[PDB]
Amino acid sequence: ALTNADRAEIIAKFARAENDTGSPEVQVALLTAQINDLQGHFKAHKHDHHSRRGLIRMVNQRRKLLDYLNGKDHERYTALIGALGLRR
Amino acid sequence: IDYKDIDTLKQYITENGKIVPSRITGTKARYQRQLALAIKQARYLSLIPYTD
Amino acid sequence: MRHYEIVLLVHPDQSDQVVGMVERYISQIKEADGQIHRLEDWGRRQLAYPINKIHKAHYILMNVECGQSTLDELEELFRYNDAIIRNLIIRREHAITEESLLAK
Amino acid sequence: QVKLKEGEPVDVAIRRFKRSCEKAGVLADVRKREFYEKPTQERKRKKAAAVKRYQKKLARES
Amino acid sequence: TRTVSEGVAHIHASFNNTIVTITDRQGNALAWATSGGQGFRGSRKSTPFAAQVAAEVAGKAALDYGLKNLDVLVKGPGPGRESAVRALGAVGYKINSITDVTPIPHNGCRPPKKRRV
RNA sequence: AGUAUGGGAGAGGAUGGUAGAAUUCCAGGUGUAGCGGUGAAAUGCGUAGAGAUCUGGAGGAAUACCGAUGGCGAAGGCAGCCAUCUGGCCUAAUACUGACGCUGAGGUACGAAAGCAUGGGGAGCAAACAGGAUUAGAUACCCUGGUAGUCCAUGCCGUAAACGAUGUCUACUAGCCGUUGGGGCCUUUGAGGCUUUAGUGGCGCAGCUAACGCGAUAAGUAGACCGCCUGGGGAGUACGGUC
Numbered sequence: 001a002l003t004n005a006d007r008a009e010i011i012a013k014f015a016r017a018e019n020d021t022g023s024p025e026v027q028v029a030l031l032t033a034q035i036n037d038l039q040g041h042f043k044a045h046k047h048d049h050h051s052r053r054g055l056i057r058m059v060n061q062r063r064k065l066l067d068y069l070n071g072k073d074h075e076r077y078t079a080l081i082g083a084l085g086l087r088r
Numbered sequence: 089i090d091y092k093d094i095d096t097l098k099q100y101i102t103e104n105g106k107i108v109p110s111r112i113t114g115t116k117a118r119y120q121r122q123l124a125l126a127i128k129q130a131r132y133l134s135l136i137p138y139t140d
Numbered sequence: 141m142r143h144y145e146i147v148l149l150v151h152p153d154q155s156d157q158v159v160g161m162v163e164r165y166i167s168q169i170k171e172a173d174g175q176i177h178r179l180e181d182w183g184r185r186q187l188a189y190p191i192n193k194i195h196k197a198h199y200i201l202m203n204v205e206c207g208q209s210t211l212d213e214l215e216e217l218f219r220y221n222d223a224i225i226r227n228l229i230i231r232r233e234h235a236i237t238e239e240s241l242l243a244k
Numbered sequence: 245q246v247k248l249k250e251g252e253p254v255d256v257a258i259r260r261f262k263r264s265c266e267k268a269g270v271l272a273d274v275r276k277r278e279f280y281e282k283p284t285q286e287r288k289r290k291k292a293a294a295v296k297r298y299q300k301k302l303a304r305e306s
Numbered sequence: 307t308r309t310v311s312e313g314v315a316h317i318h319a320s321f322n323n324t325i326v327t328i329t330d331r332q333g334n335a336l337a338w339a340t341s342g343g344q345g346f347r348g349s350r351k352s353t354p355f356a357a358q359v360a361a362e363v364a365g366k367a368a369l370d371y372g373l374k375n376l377d378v379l380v381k382g383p384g385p386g387r388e389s390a391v392r393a394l395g396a397v398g399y400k401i402n403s404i405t406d407v408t409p410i411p412h413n414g415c416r417p418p419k420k421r422r423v
Numbered sequence: 424a425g426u427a428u429g430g431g432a433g434a435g436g437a438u439g440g441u442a443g444a445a446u447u448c449c450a451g452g453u454g455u456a457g458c459g460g461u462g463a464a465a466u467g468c469g470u471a472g473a474g475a476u477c478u479g480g481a482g483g484a485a486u487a488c489c490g491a492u493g494g495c496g497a498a499g500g501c502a503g504c505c506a507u508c509u510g511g512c513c514u515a516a517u518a519c520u521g522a523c524g525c526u527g528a529g530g531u532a533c534g535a536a537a538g539c540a541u542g543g544g545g546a547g548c549a550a551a552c553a554g555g556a557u558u559a560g561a562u563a564c565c566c567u568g569g570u571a572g573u574c575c576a577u578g579c580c581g582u583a584a585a586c587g588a589u590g591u592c593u594a595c596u597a598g599c600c601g602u603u604g605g606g607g608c609c610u611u612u613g614a615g616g617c618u619u620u621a622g623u624g625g626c627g628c629a630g631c632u633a634a635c636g637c638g639a640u641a642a643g644u645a646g647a648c649c650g651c652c653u654g655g656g657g658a659g660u661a662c663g664g665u666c
Contacts, residue, residue, distance in 0.1 A: 001509085004428085011427070021427040022520035030426080041437095041509060049533065050436040050496080054510040056532080061425085068523040092241050103245075104268065106488040117493075117603075118432080124489045125504090131443080132504060133147060133228060134197075137188040138443055139487095140245075144506095189443085208507080215440090215506080226442090229505065247403040254395030257404060258388055265406050273410045273487075274383045277445095279420040280548080294492050298601090298625075305600095316476065322460065325475055333477035334453035340474090342457060349463070411445040412503085413486045415547045416573095422564060423462090 002037055014083075024069045025080050031062040032084050089122050091129040094136060100127070105139045141173065143205050143235055146214070147228045149191070150198035152184065154223040158198055161223070165202070165214065172210040177235045178203035182242045191225055203236050310336075312402075313373040315364075315394060317357075319384020322349075324357040326390055328368040328376075337367035341386075357386025358393045365397030378404035 007030065011021060014029045038055055042048065066086075070077040081088070089096065100108045100123055107127060110120045130136045150158055158181070166176050182199035191197075206214070211229075218227045246261040265271070281289075313336065316327040327338040341356035344363065350356065376399050380387045391404055 007427080017519085019427090020519060022425070022518090024426095024520070024523080027426055027520085038509080045437045045508070048437050048509065051508095051510040052436095053497080053533085057510090065425090065523070072523085094242075100489095102488085104488085107490095109489070110491080117491085120489075121433095127489080128504065129228070131188075132441090134149070134187045134189060134191060134226070211506080219440095231506075245403065245405050248401060254392060254401060257401060258391055261391075261404055261406075262388070268406070270406060270408050270410065271383050274408055277411065277417055280417045281420075290490095291492080298492060302600090302625085314476090318475065323458080325458090327454090327475050329453075329476060332453090335476060336454080338455075338475065340457070349461070409445060410487065411485085412443070412488090414445045415447085415484070416549095418548065 002033055006033070024065045025076070028062055028065050028069075028080060029084060031058050031065075032086070034058060035062070089119075089126055091126045091133060091135065093126075094130065097123075097127055097130060097136060101136070105137055141205050141207055142211075143177075143203070143232050144211065145230045145232055145236070146202045146204065148200040148202075148218070148224055149226040150200060151194060151223050151225060152196045152198055155184075155198045157223060158200065161221070162200060162202075165217070168213065169204055169206060169210060172206060172213075174210065175205045175235070176202065177205070177237045178240075180240060180243045194225065197225070199242070201240070205235065309372050311372075311374060313368065313371075313376040315376055315378040317361075317378065317380040317382075317384075317387055317390045319357065319380065319382040319387045319390065321352060321384065323351045324360060324382075324384050324386040324390060326357070326361045326364045328364050328373075336371050337364055339363040339367070352385055354386045354389035357384070358389040361390040361393035362397055365394050365399060369397070373399060375400040375402050377402050379407045380404065381406065381408045383408070 010029050010033055011026055014023075014025045015021075016023045016025060020026065035055065035058055038051075038058075042052065042055070045051075066077065066081070069080065091097070100113060102108060107124060110117065113120075115123070127136070131138050150161075162179065166174075166179070169176065178201070180201040182201065184196055185199050187195055187197060204214075215229070218224050246257065246264055248257050252260075310330045313328055313330050314333070316325075316329065318325040318327070323341055325338065325340045327335060329335045339360040341351040341353075341360050344356065344359050346353070346356040346359075376394070378391055378394065378401055380391065391401070395401060
């Protein structure tokens with residue numbers, strides 16, 4: 001599980017201003033890190049459906065934020081997906 | 089509360105060794121839950137008997 | 141790291157070894173890392189019900205702060221040592237250092 | 245563990261032990277162990293008991 | 307032949323019968339009697355009167371071994387527990403302590419089905 | 424509508440250990456004619472020694488008391504204790520983004536019990552079946568036994584009176600009495616009293632309803648989107664198709 005230090009580094013790296021925590025870039029970065037971390041957990045416990053629901057909710061939230069950012073500003077969307085290595 | 093307070097724990101045990109209900113003792117729900125946890129830990133540690 | 145509290149019941153015939161086993165465990169904790177916040181020897185106690193046809197035991201309480209590997213080694217040592225007949229390990233958040241009841 | 249003192253009679257011992265067992269309520273568990281009760285029936289009975297308890301509390305309040 | 311002063315009585319009282327067993331401590335049997343052994347065949351085995359009759363026979367049989375004070379344990383929800391424990395005092399023993407030792411599972415095995423009588 | 428930082432409650436989920444009670448069986452002492460079962464009996468067990476009582480051993484399954492009109496979960500569901508991995512919820516104040524929302528045809532995921540496939544395990548219970556009763560007959564209810572199954576691992580099946588017989592989201596509309604998890608205030612020394620919030624219950628005004636009844640957890644007053652109904656049988660049936 002990610003801790004406060006890792007989350008702080010992610011926020012510092014993707015912040016668009018000072019004390020910025022609500023930006024779509026920051027939110028998508030945090031969601032991506034959390035999903036990538038939980039992949040290892042779901043490798044071992046194949047039958048944790050109750051936690052897999054929360055994972056699916058994270059995926060859906062990330063997709064919605066990406067769609068909103070693409071609708072608003074295309075260049076920022078391209079830069080963010082390039083930085084995080086997302087295929088789309 | 090914790091399992092090492094055996095003198096306190098005996099105050100909520102009948103002669104048979106069973107836990108006394110909150111409706112009889114006059115306890116808060118959370119305090120009762122902590123009491124039950126501590127008593128079950130004490131029985132395992134053999135500080136107080138299971139039955140009789 | 142995480143704080144653990146361990147309680148051990150020792151066979152009274154092997155009570156002459158309790159000092160040795162306890163310093164061995166504490167040392168291993170030290171070269172691992174560790175911070176022994178508390179060690180209490182409750183002493184000789186009657187069991188409420190006999191265990192394995194034993195009626196008296198030596199009660200030892202330890203408070204440690206360790207990692208997962210050190211915890212696994214401690215658990216396996218407790219499992220394999222024949223003198224230790226029962227042990228309880230509880231995770232707690234906060235270091236406990238004050239003298240507790242039963243230390244009399 | 246009804247331990248008699250120096251000079252109670254047998255009948256007094258019997259009645260005091262009967263009162264102790266009535267307080268203990270072992271016979272209720274022994275009767276319950278005679279046959280298997282299904283979870284549906286158990287939940288129904290406990291719901292009825294709760295309803296009766298709440299009805300009794302209001303009556304005792306008034 | 308053997309002489310012992312302190313003994314234990316066991317009253318196994320079911321809904322179909324009652325067995326009164328007299329032993330010494332450490333559980334070595336000395337004398338016993340049941341309602342079936344005094345006639346009382348069939349359903350009459352469960353009456354309190356039969357329990358009293360069996361208890362009297364058992365106490366008199368144990369008097370030969372020569373017990374004067376005994377400890378009584380009653381197990382089972384039988385209708386003859388009270389008569390069985392009373393008859394011993396009439397016989398003449400001293401009941402030091404009498405208790406209940408009925409077993410209760412801590413949610414163990416599954417009991418049989420309910421009778422649709 | 425969402426994000427970061429402090430705190431809190433919980434049978435929420437997955438994995439692995441471990442404890443006590445009880446049932447069955449086995450071995451051994453004490454001991455001797457019954458035990459068991461029913462409305463009453465009988466089948467059955469026992470003098471190559473039961474049942475009862477005491478000691479030791481093996482194995483499987485479930486977690487008394489606490490326990491609650493309690494709690495958690497989208498639903499199905501989840502109860503001994505401990506460790507590891509992990510989801511959601513409640514609560515305070517600032518800070519941040521700036522409509523990023525609601526619903527949802529097709530689709531997809533989960534989904535009690537019974538059932539199926541491969542390999543294990545098997546204490547108790549127990550469809551099928553065997554015997555004893557009852558009865559005009561008993562195919563059943565009652566009794567004595569008892570195999571699948573109930574348990575574990577890996578998959579399938581996709582159905583229940585899967586029910587609050589009440590789709591999801593939002594706002595507004597008298598009061599009174601309880602209970603669970605938090606916040607605030609007041610006494611005044613520690614136990615109480617007022618509020619506010621998110622759940623969970625009992626009455627009840629207006630309003631609604633064929634009536635029963637519902638009534639801030641609406642079946643009231645309104646808005647958005649979806650699913651479904653059109654007399655009873657034939658019939659959730661045939662044909663075709665998909666799995």
